[PDB]
Amino acid sequence: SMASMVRFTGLSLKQTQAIEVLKGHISLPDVEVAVTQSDQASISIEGEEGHYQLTYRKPHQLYRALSLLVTVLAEADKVEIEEQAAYEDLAYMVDCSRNAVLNVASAKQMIEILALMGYSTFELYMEDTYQIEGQPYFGYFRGAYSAEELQEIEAYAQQFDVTFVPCIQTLAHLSAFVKWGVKEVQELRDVEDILLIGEEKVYDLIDGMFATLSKLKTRKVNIGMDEAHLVGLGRYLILNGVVDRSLLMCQHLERVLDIADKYGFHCQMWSDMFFKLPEETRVYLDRLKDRVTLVYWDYYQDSEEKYNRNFRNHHKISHDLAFAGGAWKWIGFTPHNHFSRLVAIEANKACRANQIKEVIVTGWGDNGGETAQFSILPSLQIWAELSYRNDLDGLSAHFKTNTGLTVEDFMQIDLANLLPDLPGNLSGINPNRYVFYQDILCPILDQHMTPEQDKPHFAQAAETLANIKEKAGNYAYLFETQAQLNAILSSKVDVGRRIRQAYQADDKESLQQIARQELPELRSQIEDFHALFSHQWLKENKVFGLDTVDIRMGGLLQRIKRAESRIEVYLAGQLDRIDELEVEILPFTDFYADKDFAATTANQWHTIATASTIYTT
Amino acid sequence: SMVRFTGLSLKQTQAIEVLKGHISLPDVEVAVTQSDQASISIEGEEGHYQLTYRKPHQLYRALSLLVTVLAEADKVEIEEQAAYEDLAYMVDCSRNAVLNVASAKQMIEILALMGYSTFELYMEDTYQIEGQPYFGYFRGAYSAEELQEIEAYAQQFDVTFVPCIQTLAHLSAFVKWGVKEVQELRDVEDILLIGEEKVYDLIDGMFATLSKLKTRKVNIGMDEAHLVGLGRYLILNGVVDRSLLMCQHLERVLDIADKYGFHCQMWSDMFFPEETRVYLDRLKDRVTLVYWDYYQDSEEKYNRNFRNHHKISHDLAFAGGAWKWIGFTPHNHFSRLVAIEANKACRANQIKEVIVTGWGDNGGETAQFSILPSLQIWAELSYRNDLDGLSAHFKTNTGLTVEDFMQIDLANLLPDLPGNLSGINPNRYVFYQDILCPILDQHMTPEQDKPHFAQAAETLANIKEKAGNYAYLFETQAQLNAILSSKVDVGRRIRQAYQADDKESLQQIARQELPELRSQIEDFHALFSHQWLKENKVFGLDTVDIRMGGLLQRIKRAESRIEVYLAGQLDRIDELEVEILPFTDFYADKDFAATTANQWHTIATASTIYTT
Numbered sequence A: 001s002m003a004s005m006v007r008f009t010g011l012s013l014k015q016t017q018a019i020e021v022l023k024g025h026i027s028l029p030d031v032e033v034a035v036t037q038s039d040q041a042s043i044s045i046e047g048e049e050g051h052y053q054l055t056y057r058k059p060h061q062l063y064r065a066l067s068l069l070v071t072v073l074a075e076a077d078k079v080e081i082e083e084q085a086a087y088e089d090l091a092y093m094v095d096c097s098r099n100a101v102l103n104v105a106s107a108k109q110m111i112e113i114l115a116l117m118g119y120s121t122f123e124l125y126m127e128d129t130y131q132i133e134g135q136p137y138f139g140y141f142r143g144a145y146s147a148e149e150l151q152e153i154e155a156y157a158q159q160f161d162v163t164f165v166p167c168i169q170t171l172a173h174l175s176a177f178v179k180w181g182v183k184e185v186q187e188l189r190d191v192e193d194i195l196l197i198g199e200e201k202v203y204d205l206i207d208g209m210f211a212t213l214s215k216l217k218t219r220k221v222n223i224g225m226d227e228a229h230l231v232g233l234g235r236y237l238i239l240n241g242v243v244d245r246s247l248l249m250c251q252h253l254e255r256v257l258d259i260a261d262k263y264g265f266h267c268q269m270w271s272d273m274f275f276k277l278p279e280e281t282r283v284y285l286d287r288l289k290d291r292v293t294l295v296y297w298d299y300y301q302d303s304e305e306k307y308n309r310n311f312r313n314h315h316k317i318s319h320d321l322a323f324a325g326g327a328w329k330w331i332g333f334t335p336h337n338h339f340s341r342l343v344a345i346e347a348n349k350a351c352r353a354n355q356i357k358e359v360i361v362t363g364w365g366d367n368g369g370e371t372a373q374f375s376i377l378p379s380l381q382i383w384a385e386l387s388y389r390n391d392l393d394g395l396s397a398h399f400k401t402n403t404g405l406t407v408e409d410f411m412q413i414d415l416a417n418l419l420p421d422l423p424g425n426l427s428g429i430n431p432n433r434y435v436f437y438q439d440i441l442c443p444i445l446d447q448h449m450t451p452e453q454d455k456p457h458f459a460q461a462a463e464t465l466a467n468i469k470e471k472a473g474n475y476a477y478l479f480e481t482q483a484q485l486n487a488i489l490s491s492k493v494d495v496g497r498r499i500r501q502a503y504q505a506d507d508k509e510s511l512q513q514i515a516r517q518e519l520p521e522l523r524s525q526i527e528d529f530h531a532l533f534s535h536q537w538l539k540e541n542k543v544f545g546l547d548t549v550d551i552r553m554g555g556l557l558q559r560i561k562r563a564e565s566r567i568e569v570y571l572a573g574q575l576d577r578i579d580e581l582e583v584e585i586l587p588f589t590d591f592y593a594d595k596d597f598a599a600t601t602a603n604q605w606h607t608i609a610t611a612s613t614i615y616t617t
Numbered sequence B: 001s002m003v004r005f006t007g008l009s010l011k012q013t014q015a016i017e018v019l020k021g022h023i024s025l026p027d028v029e030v031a032v033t034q035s036d037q038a039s040i041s042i043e044g045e046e047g048h049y050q051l052t053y054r055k056p057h058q059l060y061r062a063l064s065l066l067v068t069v070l071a072e073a074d075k076v077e078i079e080e081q082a083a084y085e086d087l088a089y090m091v092d093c094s095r096n097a098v099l100n101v102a103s104a105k106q107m108i109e110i111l112a113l114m115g116y117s118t119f120e121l122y123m124e125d126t127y128q129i130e131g132q133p134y135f136g137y138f139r140g141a142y143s144a145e146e147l148q149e150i151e152a153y154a155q156q157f158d159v160t161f162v163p164c165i166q167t168l169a170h171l172s173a174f175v176k177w178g179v180k181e182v183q184e185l186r187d188v189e190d191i192l193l194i195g196e197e198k199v200y201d202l203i204d205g206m207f208a209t210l211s212k213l214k215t216r217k218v219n220i221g222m223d224e225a226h227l228v229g230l231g232r233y234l235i236l237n238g239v240v241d242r243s244l245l246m247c248q249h250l251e252r253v254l255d256i257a258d259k260y261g262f263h264c265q266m267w268s269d270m271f272f273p274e275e276t277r278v279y280l281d282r283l284k285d286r287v288t289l290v291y292w293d294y295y296q297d298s299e300e301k302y303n304r305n306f307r308n309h310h311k312i313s314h315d316l317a318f319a320g321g322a323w324k325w326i327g328f329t330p331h332n333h334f335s336r337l338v339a340i341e342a343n344k345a346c347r348a349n350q351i352k353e354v355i356v357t358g359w360g361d362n363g364g365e366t367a368q369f370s371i372l373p374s375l376q377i378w379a380e381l382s383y384r385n386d387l388d389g390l391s392a393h394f395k396t397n398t399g400l401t402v403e404d405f406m407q408i409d410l411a412n413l414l415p416d417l418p419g420n421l422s423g424i425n426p427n428r429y430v431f432y433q434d435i436l437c438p439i440l441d442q443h444m445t446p447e448q449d450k451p452h453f454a455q456a457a458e459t460l461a462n463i464k465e466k467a468g469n470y471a472y473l474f475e476t477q478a479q480l481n482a483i484l485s486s487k488v489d490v491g492r493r494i495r496q497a498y499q500a501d502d503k504e505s506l507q508q509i510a511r512q513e514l515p516e517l518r519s520q521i522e523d524f525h526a527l528f529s530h531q532w533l534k535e536n537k538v539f540g541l542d543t544v545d546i547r548m549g550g551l552l553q554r555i556k557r558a559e560s561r562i563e564v565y566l567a568g569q570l571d572r573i574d575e576l577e578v579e580i581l582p583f584t585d586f587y588a589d590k591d592f593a594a595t596t597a598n599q600w601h602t603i604a605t606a607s608t609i610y611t612t
């Protein structure tokens, strides 16, 4: 609240205003800074004794430069900074399709942080969550962005010289749209989440998609096309018979590119359909690859060489390549910044070795968008540092300048996933989620729990996170949510197992303590978690989509009530056996069976919560 | 009773003692014998009667008839000639609701009284297979000992047992389990991988379990599975002819069945190039085909399909429907309408076996005993070719008139529906619809609907009081109709008060109406749970707890959003600014607003909930 007495020369009014916004995040000292554009480096800062010369190559690089300047002057008077960014473009892609649609205010906040970190580009992943005129079911009750909302977000990014790229889908992954049982929708379908290739009303829809996006200033779009096994194999196969499936994809892509051409767009797409690179089809693939940027996506590999093989294979067919890495926030309620760091380190090496020009960091939200949108800030800074510096020596300090938290403290956000016997190089291991949604009477994940280890882990995490929350400022909400989650998981990780132990030993006093004390308290804790979670959601996202979490959490609460009622019936002598408890628990999955830890990966709510049917007919 | 019989076996005498729990045999003397002269005949006067049956089970329908007639007359002249060699009821035990052993016995007793020869259970993954621990896991799958006990109890009444299973698709609850010993068995979706020996090893285990029974008749399934050959099959083997593929699979399954001595029935779909016609003609002669149809409102429409089937084969059975798969509330009325026309067509085509199906689509939420009227209707149509005796025999067997029992249907019986369109199910979608985002609101007609539901709740509460051991069925429905009377338009009422800035009315909804709604749904959940645990194993009720908990939490959200708005902490309730579109156009050109919506997950939310 003490106003900065910083003094700049060389700025545009655009830049002075941007800086005034960013004073809300960083603290500029009373120094004098001469600013100019120069080709010499991405960023350069020289000087001493309160007088500095700052240059940037691209305008948006001014903002990372200010973060670097703030940071270095806390340690020293004299500055000698020169960064050469490895990537011409560095982007962050938020998932707005998995129920969580980032609200406009939060998009602006994200854009400010991206600018401070060094990102050139902001992207939103929208399957059905943007409005198309004359398609009233596309996005219905999903909080689809209006054209105007998209223009406002894009315009706000432009205030920081950050570009906007919408990421859409032009063939498959349109499940929330295609479910609507009206002729105007069903006539567009092939099978599952896949649109019907060759159908003119499908190309009319796709023309409408580009109509909406042409209202923006950007002329860069990611059109999707990521793997779909059943393309050609549904209503298409009925209407048309067996076709060469790569030829079918080429036909469809050509139509999409012609539409995009009409509205002035250049298209990026996932590289999947070109992995095959029948001669005529080879030639057709080869011709279409020259009109797109291919995106090689990979969130998983633990060594540079594994990426290098794929880069080398991709470069045998196209130089117009981007790499998509991952900020892991798609595995329930809790991110995995730690894993993301591990793979970014190796991915960056390979990107550099292959002279890759563009990196997109993806922020997927699989299966309900339950992880906080701002949970992955450390992963974002990690990629910015690797691009601009090729090392992580400045990560913590820069991150603290930008956020108020050390990177180490922020990364404790991951804790509900960080069970102690896991090796750090395995992905998707997500007890945050499956421990939370598992049933009480029928704990189908119970073989994956290790209470001697897990209970104190979750209990200590709750305390750690509570301490970090006190010093997190405007990010405290993230840690408050996580602290309550960990508190819950500490008892819930084995309540199902302890019920079964008591029941088998005929320990009726313990059964009674569980049904009358522990379980009602667990409910009360989950209710408090629902409230913290809801606060988090509504801060970050539109209201739409929160409904699914209400349904899931309501159902869990009702199942805890059933455990209580079933145990009471039995304690009353009204039942000879509690049948649920006579079923022996098998492994939920063998995916990590080979390994010397019990945890696993389980990331579909509907199979975590019940072995019964719930969506099938 | 003190009724006195001559000519009975000890097996018969024991059976009749059990059935005295359901019917009141008056003090009269009855000579019994088997005779080929009629399915049932009963003659006599003034306290002495002669009863004959053709097939041993028909003794028990005969006794129901005798009880009924003697109530309005001394002298009896009955002769029935049943149209069907076999008349079966197939209970769905795969949709989460597994009929418990005690209820299977009660059902068997009723079916015996009605005149059914056969009892069937539809079991996708809900029987135990040695060495296949995930098949049925946490589903309440029947042990071989349970299935033996059920079959053995039916045999006491000379009722036969026919397992209905799946040997290719519709195994979704099994194939979900992410372990190698299950995923190696899959093609795609709910479909097993044809050609894979480990799949034939499973199928053998299926028949190994079922061979523990006395019966050697089985329905092996094979009802349409659109994507067979198109998943891992296509990836492993490329494009193959898909009908020839079905042939290779069907032969393996029949050879397996032969190993164990079974004669197979199957749904007829796969029968609607020369190497393929040859293959089909040879398999078709090995199996009985079942033409299933639950929908047509005229004899002609059935006859057209019977003529089509008769082009392929004459070893044909018909499967009709007792409508209990459309949520919480059955549709005995529609079932009656279609059974009249289907029975005309069956007779007109010399069809010998009729199977009445009791499916429980999308969670098994309709009571197992909700469709007794549909069952009696088909029995009456086989044995008499009319419904003159329906009500009085139904009252003898259950203690209720058929008209009183058929009030169970009321939450579906909106007044402007024609009688002849199926699947119209407001009982379910009015219940599970959201409050803030009422996506089915265009289908609601509150001027008509509110008083319909409100009146139904009163009618059902009166029937409950005279329903004896079936009272639970009517109590459940009374509570449901009570809820629906207010919930049918609560979402629309919120939107009207919001548009009008009627804050008094929003505050009343939030603080009195919605919490009372929650209370009533809690009460319905308790009645439902009593009903469920009476009829079914406990497994599968969890899905209902999840669905109902979720609805209650969403009602709490309606309350909290309105309270935040009322406190000035919000400028707009965004949910309420969305305009409601029709949910589906399936019935749009018609003269009613109701529709069909029978998937919980799309009733309750427009958001994603099972997809990644």
Ligand SMILES: CC(=O)N[C@H]1/C(=N/OC(=O)Nc2ccccc2)O[C@H](CO)[C@@H](O)[C@@H]1O
Pocket (backbone or CB within 6 Å): A226, A270, A297, A330, A364, A365, A366
């Ligand atoms: C391009 C992309 O990432 N597509 C999907 C996507 N696809 O990922 C995989 O299919 N990963 C994978 C598949 C097989 C084996 C190992 C990893 O991953 C994201 C995170 O789960 C999903 O949100 C995206 O929808």
Ligand SMILES: CC(=O)N[C@H]1/C(=N/OC(=O)Nc2ccccc2)O[C@H](CO)[C@@H](O)[C@@H]1O
Pocket (backbone or CB within 6 Å): B223, B267, B292, B325, B359, B360, B361
């Ligand atoms: C043999 C059978 O009845 N198969 C399914 C079944 N199939 O029915 C239809 O597919 N009906 C239908 C399909 C297309 C058009 C009109 C009716 O109906 C039952 C009740 O809904 C389901 O429970 C069964 O799993």
Ligand SMILES: [Mg+2]
Pocket (backbone or CB within 6 Å): A562, A565, A566, A569
């Ligand atoms: Mg209970």
Ligand SMILES: [Mg+2]
Pocket (backbone or CB within 6 Å): B038, B039, B054, B055, B082, B084, B085
């Ligand atoms: Mg006969």
